Design a binder for these strands. Structure first.
Lengths: 24, 479
RNA sequence: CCCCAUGAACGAGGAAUUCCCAGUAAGUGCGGGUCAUAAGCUUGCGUUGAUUAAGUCCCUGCCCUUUGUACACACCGCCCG
RNA sequence: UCAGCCACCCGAGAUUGAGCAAUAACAGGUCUGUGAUGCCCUUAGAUGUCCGGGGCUGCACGCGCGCUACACUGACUGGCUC
RNA sequence: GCGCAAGACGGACCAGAGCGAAAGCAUUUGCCAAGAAUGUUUUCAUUAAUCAAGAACGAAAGUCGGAGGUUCGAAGACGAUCAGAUACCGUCGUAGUUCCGACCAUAAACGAUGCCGACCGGCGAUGCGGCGGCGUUAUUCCCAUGACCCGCCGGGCAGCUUCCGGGAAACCAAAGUCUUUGGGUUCCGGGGGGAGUAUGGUUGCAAAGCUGAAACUUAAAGGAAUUGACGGAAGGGCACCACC
RNA sequence: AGCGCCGUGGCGCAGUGGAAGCGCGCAGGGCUCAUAACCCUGAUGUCCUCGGAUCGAAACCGAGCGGCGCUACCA
């Protein structure tokens, strides 16, 4: 379903935003 | 107050006004030093919860908690500090030192009698009736209890020491304590080649293998820490790694080669928890043998290692002069040995037994037991054979298979942690349910046929012996 | 098949369920089939001959109308992590 | 006031019971009823046939049709007529 | 049953009715400024249509400060159902729901139909202003005015109807005036995935927003309507291999 | 240190004397095309031991064993 994979995408993106920090 | 294990009815998050009132009451109770330390123990930016308990006796207790730490507790009435909060801030309450004989019983939740406090080791400063105090000892430097005075100190000393001086509200190792929480080529080539050759020699420092120097330069870690050695080879006299490999290879340290891909490959010249548990076997003396052990000091119920049973039987065969004269390997059986260690068909048949037979019979007549030391704790003694973790497969509902794991707690494994780990490993639904027999015993149910993964979990992860696990052949695969 | 003996379970049968609307259920005997000797089966035949219904979709099963459908090897379908 | 439905009379009869049964289909049962068959196997110590014996009938167990009864409107014994 | 307090919310009246650029907007009373339509033989005399850059407002949730906490209530905690429910049901209940002050700029923000203009069949209704018209009423006669009643005119929200014509069809008096193709203008799509992802840029306190690829992958994905078959949908209908 | 409560099916329990059952479990079956649940049938123990009362009992006296709890604990 759309709403949920949009959500999952935002989870993943937040996680990627954490794993790559401007300190790296 | 807490001497029994008590459950929790509920947890309430406190609004700002009630919070301020509560802190005003703590400041009134203690000195204003409380408030100075409150900002540490009760930060304004942190959540403040009250834990509502129902006692077995139907009493409503409340335990005030911020950040997981129990801080103060009350029944209908004035707030009292936990022994842990008081260990951190001992100056918030007056103190009373008690005689040693009371100590044991003081950690049994028993009230502190008057005579305990004027005998010469004890001491008694000045406090009014109703005031809250820390119970202390001579030979112990932390408060073992929290209690309230039923009599003023003067009245205590004066009366001839009869009746209850201090009601013991809280103590060490009661249930509240057990809860405990709620939910430059010189310098640079010297450093470099020192720590870098030492990180070219041992393991994981790689001994002798063809490998890239880069990987090794970026390998600064040993034993989960950096060498503090961080250096770039750009700090050396070698503007290239090829030159560094020209020098370091010249020293009878490394040998060099270039891969067809272009990396520089060197072949060196060779120049929080644990998983600890402890298990020991034991022998319990049955009634029938008591006579045989009378000389050793052991009665019915006494737990003995095999070595002690052998020493006691040998000592019994020497002291009663039962060792045969012409053969020192034989023991002539008196009425006591004949009664306890001989069968009914041998009752008058066998007059003598070798040491092997006598010792084996004496060991088999005793009740099997065992002792488990789970490190950090005192030994726990159990009766019977060591019970293996029991894995069973059941067909439930309509064609829905379940794996049930039992006797985890025997090994000191928490059913909930294991259920979680298994939930992540197997990737299905796990539950923790009550188990047949016993009392509170728990079993872990996984949805499926998972047994190989239990093989992975128990044999590999926790490194438990294969003899302690049961029912692994019914598994889909060996894993 | 026939004569004597032997003479046992069985005291109207639990959940469930089958068949049936008038010369009908049901009792009863008879003929044919199979058959050298054979019907506790079957297929027909008469004889004695009712209680209750002339109603309904509750159960079960299938029919038609409207409706929804991402199914059409058709819900034992398709399909998402 | 149309089909037809209900009561009664006149009557042997105001409901006799079966057979045959459409367009379609089922991947229903049928190599074991066919000198009806496409294949496969067997083909001379034959999966052929005839001869002589055994076996489909076996018995701690379930599930099925069916018979017989559990008695006084009955069983037995004679007698009378379909 | 009597009183008291607090915070929310304005039932019925309420409609295919009104008002607003859209979000949205219903207790009384006053104050403050707007606004469409209508009326006009008033005035200016082309001042106008649409809009990159750039600006104003922008539901809910969300975020910071403050106040406030009745109801409801994510999180959490139990109790059940269940093979399993960290779910539907139920008891408790944090953030939030409310007000004030700063952010956020996204919705199936939908009429899934850009805006201005011209033309093209009827028919009843309605809302608002105007015009005209017998007759009733506010008691009996005269004019006002209001309530119904019968029409006409101009805007509106809609409806029904039709071989106007469209259209793949559902349907549409606009989605009509389209191979007989040109009234003006802005935004914008190019098989399906990959992806509204990666990256850079930029806005934000944060969650995110705006701009936005490729490598690769794939013969379809899709829209209307048509017969089927199915439904734990709504209707009927039959049968002693259904029941009474 | 004691008092009570316990010592009855595999699992928990009833049983106010002629003297063993209730519920789950287990072997079967009925419902449905079939299984699971659902229903219906089979079955399931010196009643802690020792000694005693009692015409005769898990049911009543004591000696204990253990284990429960319960306490109130003057250590």
């Amino acid at each position: 379903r759309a709403k949920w994979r949009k959500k999952r995408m935002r989870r993943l993106k937040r996680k990627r935003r954490k794993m790559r920090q401007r300190s790296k | 107050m807490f001497a029994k294990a008590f459950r929790v009815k509920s947890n309430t998050a406190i609004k700002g006004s009630d919070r301020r009132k509560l802190r005003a009451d703590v400041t009134t109770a203690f000195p204003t030093l409380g408030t100075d330390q409150v900002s540490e123990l009760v930060p304004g930016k942190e959540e403040l919860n009250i834990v509502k308990l129902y006692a077995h006796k139907g009493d409503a207790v409340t335990v005030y908690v911020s950040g997981g730490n129990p801080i103060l507790f009350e029944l209908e009435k004035n707030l009292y500090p936990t022994v842990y909060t008081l260990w951190s801030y001992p100056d918030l309450l007056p103190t009373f030192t008690t005689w040693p004989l009371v100590l044991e019983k003081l950690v049994g939740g028993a009230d502190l009698m008057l005579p305990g406090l004027v005998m010469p080791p004890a001491g008694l400063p000045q406090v009014q009736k109703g005031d809250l105090c820390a119970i202390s000892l001579v030979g112990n430097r932390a408060p073992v209890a929290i209690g309230v005075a039923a009599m003023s100190t003067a009245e205590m000393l004066t009366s001839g020491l009869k009746g209850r001086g201090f009601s013991v509200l809280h103590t060490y190792q009661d249930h509240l304590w057990r809860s405990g929480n709620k939910s430059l080529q010189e310098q640079m080539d010297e450093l470099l080649q020192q720590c870098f050759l030492h990180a070219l020699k041992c393991r994981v420092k790689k001994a002798d293998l063809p490998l890239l120097t880069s990987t090794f330069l970026g390998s600064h870690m040993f034993s989960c820490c950096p060498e503090g050695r961080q250096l770039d080879i750009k700090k050396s006299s070698y503007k290239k790694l090829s030159k560094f490999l020209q020098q370091m290879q010249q020293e009878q340290i490394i040998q060099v080669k270039e891969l067809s891909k272009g990396v520089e490959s060197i072949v060196a010249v060779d120049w929080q928890p644990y998983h600890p548990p402890d298990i020991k076997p034991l022998y319990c003396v049955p009634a029938s043998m008591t006579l045989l052990f009378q000389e050793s000091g052991h009665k019915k119920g006494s737990f003995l290692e095999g070595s002690e049973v052998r020493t006691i039987v040998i000592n019994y065969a020497k002291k009663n002069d039962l060792v045969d004269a012409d053969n020192k390997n034989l023991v002539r059986l008196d009425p006591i040995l004949c009664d306890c260690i001989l069968e009914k068909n041998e009752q008058h048949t066998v007059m003598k037994l070798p040491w092997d037979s006598l010792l084996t019979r004496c060991l088999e007549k005793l009740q099997p037991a065992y002792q488990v030391t789970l490190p950090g704790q005192e030994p726990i003694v159990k009766k019977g054979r060591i019970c293996p973790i029991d894995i069973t497969l059941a067909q439930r509902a309509s064609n829905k298979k379940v794996t049930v794991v039992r006797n985890l707690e025997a090994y000191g494994l928490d059913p909930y942690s294991v259920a979680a780990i298994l939930q992540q490993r197997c990737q299905a639904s796990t539950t923790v349910n009550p188990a047949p027999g016993a009392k509170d015993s728990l079993q872990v149910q996984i949805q499926g046929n998972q047994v190989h993964h239990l093989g992975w979990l128990l044999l590999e992860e926790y490194q438990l012996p294969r003899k302690h696990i049961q029912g692994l052949e019914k598994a889909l695969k060996p894993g």
